Write a protein that binds this ligand. Structure first.
Ligand code: 49D
Ligand code: 49D
Ligand code: MG
Ligand code: MG
Ligand code: ZN
Ligand code: ZN
Lengths: 326, 322
């Protein structure tokens, strides 16, 4: 017969390994089975004795604790984890990383934005929210994401780590914390600098070198929308702006400082992306490409195409503006 | 009784102050006096009644642990006060820096549960989860401090412009977080590096001096006269033994240094005085030479007395082993 949607066709299983995967085609259950497959496929179920039913329940519980924000939602969480999965195969990460490290990368990726409220750290801090007060202005959102993740894992029925010895739990916990806290974009430049410092003489057996590489990998996945095919990447920009304009409107309304790059009166889809692609995304992937040359063809190539395309779109937007006064 | 005598006011400036004489209300008045006396009420337009309410609210949020209680909070604040005079800190620090120092000292152990970070993390408590194993207690004390200040009746900063608030908040966070002893060696290394060529106009140098200053006050019990210092040790052990009992009882790791079967009053202090307190105050003394005689002196005397007490403990134990 034809099988229900939550049983994945072998074609889907093959495509899920690539960054070309159309993340929009699927509904929550399907995305959940994809994530489930990822954990069996990467050998994590086997190597950490994860009860398969607990795995399913953990995923449903993770899903429940993402909110319906325009951008920072379950689908984002899915993109980040799916990109991480793609890079595991693209860069043959199982040759460089222990299975515990793969578990840290994957789990951190899935958990990195739990219960995101849809307003960034600058808002939390400027408006003196309960979160800012609780975290003393220190990466409040990312601390919260990480706490929710471990609240979830402390419910015994959601605890995928239940059969891991306490030495492994401690190593995994600290790994996930580092990685989730590393996604706070306030720290982008710091982390990139530390990473570039090690890249002068990179050493795969050096634990500090690897920690940074993992921090860079999760960061790559977190903001990797523009790496994806044009058709898959574009709607994410509408989602981004919808969520961010919601914040700046509120900042205006409550008399809080407003950042030009998020002002709904000043921003186009093009100006949102160009600078970000040229000066944040491209340099980051260029550096990763030095360790993993195969990344150039698969991830810098589409970033270049997207830069050029949005640069052209701006020339056109500007010419059109000029024309209404010229 | 309610009102402080001029002798009390005078004694409050010195580290000889007998912290045990006073009950909570009289300690609150002493803390009140410090804020007026330092010019903080004047220079920040603190509403005088809000100041009293704030202190009462702070008081309400300290717990009745044997050691980490409102009286410890008083000792730290009062030792800070003493150092402002001893080291003439109003010449070197802005009034904002003094306010940060005093307010952080008062707030630095708010709502302490009586079991340290190692317990929080190993037991996987609510606080360790909330703060991801990163100085959970000290983040929590800080959080509580600003929840208190968000209540408008307790807000001693209500007449400070936003920018000043932000600066005070940042300073307070750094100092309360610096009290975590897991960071002792890191902070000492950083400070000793700056003492290679210290600069009162470098903000990073001043930030570390304040971190060192609050640390000094936090752990300063042994600097006080013996009659005042000794009872704090019983409190210390009472509280730390309560933890280690619970740790044995729950299958969690127990540290020899706080094991009720292994620890005498003397073995608790000798190492701490010799390797934590003396070297820290030695470094501070290089900036403030008057510290040597007022604070390193009672420390040397304390070290020597506990070393004697240990020799006599070891002798009475030779009358026991079977
Ligand atoms: C500069 C930034 N552009 C951008 N930001 C992105 C992307 C993905 N994640 N992020 C940000 C959301 C948190 C990690 C940075 C992306 O593809 N583009 C931006 C421009 C305009 C607005 Cl309205 C919002 C963000
Ligand atoms: C080594 C430590 N000694 C010690 N620790 C002290 C003192 C003051 N504060 N503290 C600690 C309380 C947390 C900031 C350090 C003190 O006077 N002595 C200690 C030994 C045995 C037990 Cl049971 C507890 C503590
Ligand atoms: Mg995030
Ligand atoms: Mg403390
Ligand atoms: Zn994200
Ligand atoms: Zn303390």
């Amino acid at each position: 017969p034809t099988y229900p949607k939550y049983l994945l066709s072998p074609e889907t299983i093959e495509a899920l390994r690539k960054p070309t995967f159309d993340v929009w085609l699927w509904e929550p259950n399907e995305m959940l089975s994809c994530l489930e497959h990822m954990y069996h496929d990467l050998g994590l179920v086997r190597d950490f004795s994860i009860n398969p039913v607990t795995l399913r329940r953990w995923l449903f519980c993770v899903h429940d604790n993402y909110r319906n924000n325009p951008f920072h939602n379950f689908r984002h969480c899915f993109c980040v984890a799916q990109m991480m999965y793609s890079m595991v195969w693209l860069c043959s990460l199982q040759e460089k990383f222990s299975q515990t490290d793969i578990l840290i990368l994957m789990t951190a990726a899935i958990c990195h934005d739990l219960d995101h409220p849809g307003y960034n750290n600058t808002y939390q801090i400027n408006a003196r929210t309960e979160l800012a007060v609780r975290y003393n202005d220190i990466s409040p959102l990312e601390n919260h994401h990480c706490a929710v993740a471990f609240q979830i894992l402390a419910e015994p029925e959601c605890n995928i780590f239940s059969n891991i010895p306490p030495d492994g739990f401690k190593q995994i916990r600290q790994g996930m914390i580092t990685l989730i806290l590393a996604t706070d974009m306030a720290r982008h430049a710091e982390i990139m600098d530390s990473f570039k410092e090690k890249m002068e003489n990179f050493d795969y057996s050096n634990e500090e070198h690897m920690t940074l590489l993992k921090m860079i990998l999760i960061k790559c996945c977190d903001i990797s929308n523009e790496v994806r095919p044009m058709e898959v990447a574009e709607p994410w920009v509408d989602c981004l702006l919808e969520e961010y304009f919601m914040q700046s409107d509120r900042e205006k309304s409550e008399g809080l400082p407003v950042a030009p790059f998020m002002d709904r009166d000043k921003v186009t889809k093009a100006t949102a992306q160009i600078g970000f692609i040229k000066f944040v995304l491209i340099p980051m992937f260029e550096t990763v490409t030095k360790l993993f040359p195969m990344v150039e063809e698969i991830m810098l190539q589409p970033l270049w195409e997207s830069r050029d395309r949005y640069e052209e779109l701006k020339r056109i937007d500007d010419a059109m503006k000029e024309l209404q006064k010229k």
